[PDB]
Design brief:
- The complex is a heterotrimer of chains A (about 475), B (about 350) and C (about 130).
- By secondary structure, chain A is of the alpha+beta class.
- In chain A, helix 1 crosses helix 2 and helix 1 packs across helix 3.
- The chains are: A alpha+beta (about 475), B mainly beta (about 350), C mainly alpha (about 130).
- Bound molecules: the ligand Cc1cc(C)c(CN2CCc3c(Cl)cc(-c4c(C)noc4C)c(Cl)c3C2=O)c(=O)[nH]1 and zinc ion (7 copies).
- Chain B: It is found in: Nucleus; Chromosome.
């Protein structure tokens, strides 16, 4: 009770006071530190100037011609012009980071608002001689910072389990950070390749530290408290018993109680369902894998035929799933996923700029390297190609209808391979455990030390 | 300050760099050096404004175009050395006592925009480039100690850099609006320096291993709103300029935050105030200070040359004098105080040199 | 073979005692690691406790570079061997368990694993 005109006048008088108060605080805070900064100089510069006193550096002395004049009538000087003998430069290259696998890229304050409130607050108190007529005045003077309500509570103003504050919670709340933030596909947390969050179905098959670990372990173990105990640590085949009673990109499909028919994303997108899909195991659209015995580099093998590498979890027989030891293995069709690239050498091109040379021979159709870079939306590639055209240059390469791989900022050494309409290498995009990747393959045999080329034009027909 | 001479080199090309030799003995004459076109030129300063031409070099290649230089010495010989470089992305170390080009370094994949030697180790050369990277060389053992850049380095041309007084940290600036802190007193870096001194090629078949430091110890795009083209430390505070016609004085972190505790994810900057001036909104115009860091001088796109006195407190009341002269109308690209602050050389877009004297 | 080759990461020329510019046998190039442990720390949304395990797991999965579902079991056994000390010392045993259980709900490891590992860890904690 003082009248709205009055209160809003106070808001202004007070805010304008605090602000001006804090203005001076900092005014000095700065003055303070410019000084305590100066001493720092003095004390250090002296250290340098000492070191320099110790030293005894020879004076520079006087020596095709060069002259120098003087727009102040001083005598023209003339002197011998020495030539520094030529040095060779190398071609232009901008900074890049090394990749071995694609990498995905996407496309009045609170602190004072409170002081003013408590300022106002003390006057409403000092009246008698957290009010509501106050939040209204502040809303009048800063109608943008919100209304009375929105300020009425702005003012008023994810556990851990190894630490002391481990609440007792749901099981789906102890495993939350893990469930959402983990890639069933690369087995990494917050992976660098897969932005879409895993559907719910992709992860289903005392003190809190104890109650939680309980409500969690029962989800996995259920009623075998013999084990629920062994794990929970300090409880018993009993006590737990007692606590008891109280070309389109691929993305996995998750349509429960729906068959993979004409409404399924994978079938619409013209892709095979993969292991990562949450559909039946009977699914008619899953890719079987091959039962080859070895090789897998011909139309004989269904995987190669369908332009897929073998899958280490379906092609159990060709050698693709064993021997995580060598990159030479029975199955010649998993060079990308295991990453068995050939040694490459970088030297100035024989045509232009930088080029790339293979170090050891290579048969027709043999794999040479993956072409790696950042995965970006078709729109990012737009935006970026505007900046790129300046250079009459481009290291964009279509991956599929949804993604482009751009080797400008990051990639691997096969990006130094130059364009030609008469290449000795070619690019084939393959599906590889649910990822489209670009494999660079030789087009004819190739010998020690040859320069590598492929025809950038097809990698540019995303028509 | 009074203007007391003005020189013109015969080539009529912009002079981007000028640097007094701050290693001269007490008693030896004040020598400074100039780069522009494809030339490096030394000058001895004498009394009554006389400036005496000492030496001058020209690059065999006609399309070289030197933007910067820096003075160091050879510990074991007491000879000055002048490093220079420019658009061909090549460093030369010139030995003026002998008139040779004694070393050179190919490596940067584009133009070098600045060069700075280590405050306390004559042999560590930092080079800033249009390839988006810094690079720290060890010029005794001829080894590339470190490339500062990568996934969290500069997204665009790096225009400038500076060691702090003691040689512990570097800050860099460039066309992406960013300034960056790179420590070189981490165990990794000091270890790479030591290791670099040990490298003996004649005793191994393996190329020295260069540190790829992909991550700055601190970053910000919040001081200026445009390419940043000069930066130098003032103590543990930082001075930096863009084209918005003001040198800004700021520190990383919050006001009381200590430069050595600032964490690589700190997202606060604190602006301590700025120096105002006008008509300097073309890019690539650099400032400087004394060895004692009491004087700050900046030149103009139209021949003006400002000099502030850093001794005061606030930037606002910063003592500023504006040196001017009827004949100096060229843009000033860079300035340089003799070590004893007695002299002030400025160089211009038109080959001109202007010498100012104190008292 | 008769030509002048340069290291792809510095552009310095190759002295003859090479060939070999595989300064990118970097299965897990250093920056990708630093990048990942930085990105995890950026969540205001995750205990320092579930972070340090996510960080360590990722570094682990990156170093060896598993690629198949049928490697996960051996990978957990490997995780605890190589990173077991730290999990203990840094007080990250329970979180590590919520990891092991999550990896089950995702259908990667077996139940005989999800404790055959918890065993080997305490069997290691006491070793100190
Ligand atoms: C086959 C082959 C591949 C590569 C990568 C090089 C080296 N090189 C050529 C020159 C070049 C320009 Cl003119 C502009 C950019 C550039 C920036 C910077 N931002 O977008 C682009 C686009 C970049 Cl990256 C480069 C670059 O690195 C080579 O010589 N040959
Ligand atoms: Zn992923
Ligand atoms: Zn489906
Ligand atoms: Zn599917
Ligand atoms: Zn299906
Ligand atoms: Zn097969
Ligand atoms: Zn197969
Ligand atoms: Zn196969």
């Amino acid at each position: 009770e003082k009248g709205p005109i009055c209160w809003r006048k106070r808001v202004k008088s007070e805010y304008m006071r605090l602000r001006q108060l804090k203005r001076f605080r900092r005014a000095d805070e700065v003055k303070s530190m410019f000084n305590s900064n100066r001493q720092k100089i003095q004390e250090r510069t002296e250290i340098l100037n000492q070191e320099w006193k110790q030293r005894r550096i020879q004076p520079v002395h006087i020596m095709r011609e060069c002259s120098v004049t003087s727009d102040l009538d001083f005598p023209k000087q003339v002197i011998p012009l020495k030539t520094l003998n030529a040095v060779a430069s190398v071609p232009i290259m901008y900074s890049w980071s090394p990749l071995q696998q694609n990498f995905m890229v996407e496309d009045i304050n609170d602190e004072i608002f409170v002081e003013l409130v408590n300022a106002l607050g003390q006057l409403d108190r000092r009246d008698e001689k957290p009010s509501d007529k106050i939040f209204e005045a502040i809303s009048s003077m800063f109608p943008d910072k919100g209304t009375a309500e929105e300020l009425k509570e702005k003012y008023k103003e994810t556990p851990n389990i190894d630490g002391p504050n481990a609440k007792s919670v749901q099981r789906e709340q102890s495993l939350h950070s893990f469930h959402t933030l983990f890639c069933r596909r690369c087995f990494k947390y917050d992976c660098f390749l897969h932005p879409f969050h895993a559907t719910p179905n992709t992860y289903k098959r005392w003190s809190g530290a104890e109650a939680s670990m309980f409500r969690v372990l029962i989800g996995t173990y259920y009623d075998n408290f013999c084990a629920i105990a062994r794990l929970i640590g300090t409880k018993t085949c009993r006590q737990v018993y007692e606590f008891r009673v109280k070309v389109y990109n691929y993305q996995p499909c998750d349509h429960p109680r729906q068959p993979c028919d004409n409404s399924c994303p994978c079938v619409i997108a013209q892709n095979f369902c993969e292991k990562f899909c949450q559909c039946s195991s009977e699914c008619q659209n899953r890719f079987p894998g091959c039962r080859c015995k070895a090789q897998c580099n011909t139309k004989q093998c269904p995987c190669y035929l369908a332009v897929r590498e073998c899958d280490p979890d379906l092609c159990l027989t060709c050698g693709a799933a064993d021997h995580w030891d060598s990159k030479n293995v029975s199955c010649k069709n998993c060079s990308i996923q295991r990453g068995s690239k050939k040694h490459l050498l970088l030297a100035p091109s024989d045509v232009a700029g930088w080029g790339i040379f293979i170090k050891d021979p290579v048969q027709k159709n043999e794999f040479i390297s993956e072409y790696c870079g950042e995965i970006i939306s078709q729109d990012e590639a737009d935006r970026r190609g505007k900046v790129y055209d300046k250079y009459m240059c481009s290291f964009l390469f279509n991956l599929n209808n949804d993604f482009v791989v751009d080797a400008t900022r990051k990639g691997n050494k096969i990006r130094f391979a130059n364009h030609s309409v008469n290449p000795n290498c070619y690019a084939k995009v393959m599906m590889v455990n649910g990822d489209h990747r670009i494999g660079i393959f030789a087009k004819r045999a190739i010998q020690t030390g040859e320069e590598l080329f492929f025809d950038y034009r097809y990698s540019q027909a995303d028509a | 300050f009074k203007c007391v001479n003005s020189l013109k080199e015969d080539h009529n090309q912009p002079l981007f760099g000028v640097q007094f030799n701050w290693h001269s003995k007490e008693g030896d004459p004040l020598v400074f050096a100039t780069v522009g076109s494809n030339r490096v030129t030394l000058y001895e300063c004498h009394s009554q404004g006389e400036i005496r031409l000492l030496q001058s070099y020209v690059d065999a290649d006609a399309d070289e175009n030197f933007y910067t230089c820096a003075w160091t010495y050879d510990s074991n010989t007491s000879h000055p050395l002048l490093a220079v470089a420019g658009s061909r992305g090549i460093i030369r170390i010139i030995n003026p006592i002998t008139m040779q080009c004694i070393k050179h370094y190919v490596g940067h994949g584009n133009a070098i925009n600045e060069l700075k030697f280590h405050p306390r180790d004559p042999n560590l050369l930092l080079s800033v480039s249009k390839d988006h990277a810094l690079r720290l060389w060890n010029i005794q053992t001829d080894t590339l100690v470190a490339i500062f850049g990568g996934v969290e380095g500069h997204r665009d041309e790096v225009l400038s850099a500076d060691y702090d007084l003691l040689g512990e940290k570097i800050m860099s600036c460039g066309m992406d609006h960013s300034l960056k802190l790179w420590r070189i007193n981490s165990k990794r870096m000091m270890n790479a320096i030591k290791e670099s001194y040990d490298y003996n090629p004649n005793k191994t078949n393996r190329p020295f291993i260069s540190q790829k430091i992909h991550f700055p110890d601190f970053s910000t795009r919040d001081i200026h709103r445009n390419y940043v083209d000069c930066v130098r430390w003032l103590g543990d505070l930082i001075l930096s300029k863009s084209c918005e016609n003001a040198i800004v004085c700021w520190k990383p972190g919050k006001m009381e935050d200590d430069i050595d505790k600032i964490k690589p994810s700190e997202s606060n900057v604190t602006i301590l105030g700025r120096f105002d001036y006008s008509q300097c909104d073309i890019w690539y115009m650099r400032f400087s200070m004394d060895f004692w860091q009491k004087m700050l001088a900046l030149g103009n796109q139209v021949g003006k040359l400002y000099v502030w006195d850093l001794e005061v407190e606030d930037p606002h009341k910063a003592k500023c004098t504006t040196l001017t002269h009827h004949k100096c109308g060229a843009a000033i690209r860079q300035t340089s105080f003799s070590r004893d602050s007695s002299i002030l050389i400025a160089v211009c877009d038109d080959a001109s040199i202007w010498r100012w004297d104190r008292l | 073979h008769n030509r002048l080759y340069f290291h792809s990461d510095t552009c310095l020329p190759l002295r003859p005692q090479e060939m070999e510019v595989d300064d990118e046998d970097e299965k897990d190039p250093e920056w990708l690691r630093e990048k990942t442990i930085t990105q995890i720390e950026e969540f205001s949304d995750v205990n320092e406790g579930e972070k340090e395990v996510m960080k360590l797991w990722n570094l682990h999965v990156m170093k060896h570079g598993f690629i198949a579902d049928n490697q996960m079991n051996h990978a957990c056994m490997l995780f605890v061997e190589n990173y077991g000390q730290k999990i203990i010392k840094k007080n990250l045993c329970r979180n590590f368990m919520l990891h092991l259980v999550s990896m089950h709900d995702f259908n990667l490891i077996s139940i005989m694993s999800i404790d055959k590992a918890v065993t080997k860890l305490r069997e290691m904690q006491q070793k100190l």
